[PDB]
């Protein structure tokens, strides 16, 4: 997914990445998406909660 | 090296002014107060203040930060009182101390090299401030270090204060 989004190169994606990652890599955004998803899975309607 | 070869390499014998670390990174500022652009630029600038060791002299300090008139430096871990004397927060030492350290260093190299040629390959991991070399070491499965085993134990190193360390170096 991440590679696909970097390929699109949409301004918004870079806007998000820049904010929730370090100056060297993007692993923190990876952990963020994992975490948000996992949390949303405890709702009867995950996508609505998101 | 730089001091020992200064005369030959440069032209004149020199004096240790210090050793400094520069943190290469693109910092992020976490401020509770709203900052104007100039203030932000100042905070970013501050994030690059160099740690390390200095020579405890007002002149050396002023040569490292010609901006500093009074107070704390934003470039080095030094500061000048209203007096104009060095702040005691400053990370500095005297001449004797710098030379003391460098001598200790060469001692370390001599002894180590000696033991290396002596064929010393013993498994002796240190432990200091809960930090071990093992965490970053690729050879954990080669050494097969087992603390539960008798004859396998860490080397406890006491994290002493600078004054204590230099004290040891002098007495040794």
């Amino acid at each position: 997914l991440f590679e696909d989004e970097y390929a699109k190169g949409e301004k918004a994606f870079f806007e998000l990445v820049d904010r929730y990652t370090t100056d060297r890599h993007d692993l923190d955004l990876q952990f963020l998406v994992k975490q948000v998803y996992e949390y949303s899975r405890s709702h009867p309607n995950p996508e609505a909660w998101l | 090296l730089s001091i020992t070869h200064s005369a030959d390499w440069l032209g004149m014998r020199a004096t240790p002014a210090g050793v400094l670390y520069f943190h290469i990174h693109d910092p992020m500022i976490q401020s509770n107060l709203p900052l104007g652009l100039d203030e932000i630029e100042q905070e970013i600038f501050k994030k690059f203040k160099m740690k390390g060791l200095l020579l405890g002299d007002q002149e050396v300090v002023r040569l490292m930060d010609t901006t500093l008139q009074e107070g704390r430096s934003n470039i080095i871990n030094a500061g000048l009182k209203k007096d104009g004397s060095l702040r005691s927060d400053s990370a500095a030492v005297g001449e004797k101390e710098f030379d003391l350290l460098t001598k200790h260093v060469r001692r370390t190299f001599q002894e180590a090299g000696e033991q290396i040629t002596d064929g010393r390959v013993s498994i002796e991991p240190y432990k200091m401030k809960n930090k071990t070399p093992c965490t970053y070491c690729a050879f954990k499965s080669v050494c097969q270090f087992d603390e539960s085993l008798e004859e396998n134990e860490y080397r406890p190193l006491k994290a002493e204060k600078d004054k204590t360390i230099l004290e040891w170096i002098k007495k040794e």
Binding site: - | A138, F139, K140, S141, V142, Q144, F145
Partner: protein
Amino acid sequence: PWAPQIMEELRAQGIPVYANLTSGYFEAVEVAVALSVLKVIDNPYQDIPLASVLRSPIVGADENELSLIRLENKKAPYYEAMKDYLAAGDRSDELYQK
């Protein structure tokens, strides 16, 4: 994360301990060693697992015998050096036999 160190001390004092643990397996030396064997079988051209197996009780090569293997070929992979030692060594050597 406190449980293992508790178990070790209570076991050290004759007190039987049970605990369903979910961590610590891969830092056990036997596991590192057996795994190393499996890796070497998958691909011997991994210096660290090979050296691990050689130094383990599985083979019992000591530090001298290890550096001795290295001397046959310094630049190549450790496996290459081992093969070379075999190629040159005489069957009367203990190291050769290992």
